């Protein structure tokens, strides 16, 4: 994993460059929006359990997925499904602080589309539960912070489809 | 199932089923005609067990159906009674399997993290299981009720 | 007018603790600062808030001190997502149809008809 700072040091290190004006622009962009990210990271961490409760109610609590025979029917399959939304919200917050989507490829998306196919989990339903979790979060944290969190939700959705 | 649970106990120790384990599986299959009659006594009394068991629950826990509770509303109380039907169905599965394995893998594993996510009081679901046990055990004799009473007893303790 | 410093707050808060609220507002209303400005026939006001040629002011006092502050803000503050069991919605995707849904063209077959 690398954040927005480590991402710029690593790209200049493999070229042998001192930090020029173009690398200093990317470093200034993160330092300016850095106060906006520590504010959303503390408001998402305090409403973590109730964000997923409202995001499931908006997407797939009132479909027939919980009907007998589908996924998330039994208690084990219902509890394991909110644990993933529990995963996606916590790793999209690590990516919004770091300013880099690098941690999602390493610790989330690695072999995940094959894991859902082996288990049978509907991937299009997981994407709409994540799109609801994007709407619930973007109203809690605001428009600027909510538009950054929605940048790393789309990254999980694109790497999952 | 008593058969499956006895095989995983032997396979874990890398051995054959002992004569004491085999002797238990013998009287399990021979008593199958009687155990199938206990499960059918509950299967033909769902309307009385789930209606009475749910009416008794809402009198000991009136706040779950009062305005502001989890099971408030026509559709919400129906889901409330829908869950007592889920747990009465699993108790008939366990009477036939001879073990609490059908109840455990369907509706007991991950049940506390599940209800806490929906905001449902876990102690209000255990109260509705104890009230179904009162109706169900009154339909059976001295023996054949201690058998049915255990599967209701385990679901209470395992749910808390 | 505004508090001079946070020792004026300490000096006057012991009137409320030993005489109650009724003796604190008798002592405040009988200061010469009150009787020279408002007397007994004028409603009080924020004195000298804005300089005569300036465009901005000095943050009027109902906005500078609301009902409660940073203390009490960790017990009197409300919440979002309160675990409160509200009214349900039951079919959320039927209110916001997706792109290829012919329910977006449903109040158009009323127009282009036999007429």
């Amino acid at each position: 994993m690398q954040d927005a700072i480590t991402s710029v040091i690593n790209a200049a290190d493999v070229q042998g460059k001192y930090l020029d004006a173009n690398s200093v622009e990317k470093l200034r962009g993160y330092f300016q929006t850095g106060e906006l990210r520590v504010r959303a990271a503390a408001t998402i961490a305090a409403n973590a359990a109730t964000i997923i409760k409202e995001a499931v109610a908006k997407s797939l609590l009132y479909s027939d997925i919980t009907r007998p025979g589908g996924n998330m029917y039994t208690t084990r399959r219902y509890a394991a499904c909110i644990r993933d939304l529990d995963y996606y919200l916590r790793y999209a917050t690590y990516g919004m602080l770091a300013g880099d989507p690098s941690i999602l490829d390493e610790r989330v998306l690695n072999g995940l589309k094959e894991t859902y196919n082996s288990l049978g989990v509907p991937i299009g339903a997981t994407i709409q539960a994540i799109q609801a979790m994007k709407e619930v979060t973007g109203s809690l944290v605001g428009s600027d912070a909510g538009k950054e969190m929605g940048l790393y939700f789309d990254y999980i959705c694109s790497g999952l489809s | 199932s008593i058969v499956t649970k006895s095989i995983v106990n032997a396979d874990a120790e890398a051995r054959y089923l002992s004569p004491g384990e085999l002797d238990r599986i013998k009287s399990f299959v021979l008593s199958g005609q009687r155990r199938l009659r206990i499960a059918q006594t509950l299967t033909e009394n769902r309307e009385r067990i789930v209606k009475q068991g749910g009416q008794q629950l809402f009198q000991r826990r009136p706040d779950v159906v009062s305005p502001g509770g989890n099971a408030y509303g026509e559709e919400m109380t129906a889901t409330c009674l829908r869950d007592l039907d889920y747990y009465l169905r699993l108790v008939t599965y366990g009477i036939i399997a001879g073990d609490v394995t059908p109840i455990e893998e369907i509706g007991l594993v991950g049940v506390k993290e599940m209800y806490s996510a929906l905001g449902t009081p876990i102690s209000g679901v255990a109260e509705g299981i104890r009230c179904m046990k009162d109706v169900a055990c009154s339909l059976l004799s001295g023996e054949d009720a201690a058998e049915v009473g255990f599967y209701f007893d385990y679901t209470l303790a395992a749910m808390q | 007018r505004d508090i001079y410093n946070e020792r004026e707050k300490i000096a006057w808060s012991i009137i409320i603790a030993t005489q109650g609220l009724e003796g604190f507002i008798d002592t405040l209303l009988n200061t010469q600062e009150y009787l020279s400005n408002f007397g007994d026939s004028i409603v009080p006001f924020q004195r000298r808030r804005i300089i005569p040629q300036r465009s901005k002011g000095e943050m009027p006092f109902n906005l500078k001190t609301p009902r409660y502050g940073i203390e009490f803000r960790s017990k009197l503050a409300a919440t979002q997502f309160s675990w409160a069991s509200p009214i349900r919605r039951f079919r959320p995707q039927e209110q916001q149809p997706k792109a290829g849904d012919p329910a977006l063209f449903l109040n158009m077959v009323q127009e282009m008809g036999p007429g």
């Binding site: 027939d64 997925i65 009907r67 996924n71 509907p122 | 369907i106 | 079919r91 039927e94």
Partner: peptide
């Protein structure tokens, strides 16, 4: 495998196809 087990064949829900009018 176990008691409550998922399979594509015994899945009659609209979970793999998002027909949201059902």
């Amino acid at each position: 495998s176990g008691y409550g087990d998922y399979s594509y064949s015994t899945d009659r829900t609209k979970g793999h196809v998002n027909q949201y009018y059902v």
